[PDB]
């Protein structure tokens, strides 16, 4: 029920969240919308992001979501082609970790739920 069952613990859930953070890092698609701040901070979206992705979305609110990354929006230029960046990215991390492919298809259609990318790009 919660991510740390889907992973089978907190060990595999710091592997997936440092893996998941350090391609997001590399990845010069994305990596200029955390330009203006810092590595932990960066981090704790990643964990955000995936732990939205596995499916405690309750915590985040489309509501919060789009004021949350309208700077983004407005002001760095966020648009769709960089949203499914960050998705793919967490899918690549995971397919790396051994992260059965089923548990991959749940997590994408949650990371890519079209209510969530219309939050986001506040579209
Ligand atoms: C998609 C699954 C998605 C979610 C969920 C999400 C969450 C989220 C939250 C909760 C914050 C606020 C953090 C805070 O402390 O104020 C937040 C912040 C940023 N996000 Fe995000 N975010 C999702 C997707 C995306 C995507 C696709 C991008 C693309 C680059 C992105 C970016 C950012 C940025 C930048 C911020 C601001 C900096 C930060 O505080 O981390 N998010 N997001
Ligand atoms: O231990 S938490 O900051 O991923």
New binding site residues.
């Given amino acids: 029920s919660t991510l740390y069952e889907k992973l089978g613990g907190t060990t595999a859930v710091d592997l997936a969240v440092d893996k998941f953070y350090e391609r997001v890092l590399q990845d010069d698609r ?1 990596k200029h ?2 330009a203006d ?1 810092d590595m932990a ?2 981090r ?2 990643q964990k ?2 995936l732990t ?2 596995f499916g405690g979305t309750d915590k ?1 609110d489309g509501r ?2 789009r004021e ?2 309208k700077e ?1 929006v407005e002001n760095h230029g ?1 648009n769709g082609e ?2 499914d960046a ?2 793919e990215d967490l899918l690549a991390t995971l397919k790396e970790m051994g992260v059965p492919e089923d548990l991959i298809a749940e997590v994408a259609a949650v ?1 890519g739920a079209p209510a ?1 990318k219309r939050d ?1 790009l506040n579209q």
């Fill in positions: 994305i919308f955390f701040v901070k960066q704790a979206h955000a992001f939205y992705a985040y919060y979501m949350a990354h983004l966020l960089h949203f960050v998705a990371a969530h986001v």
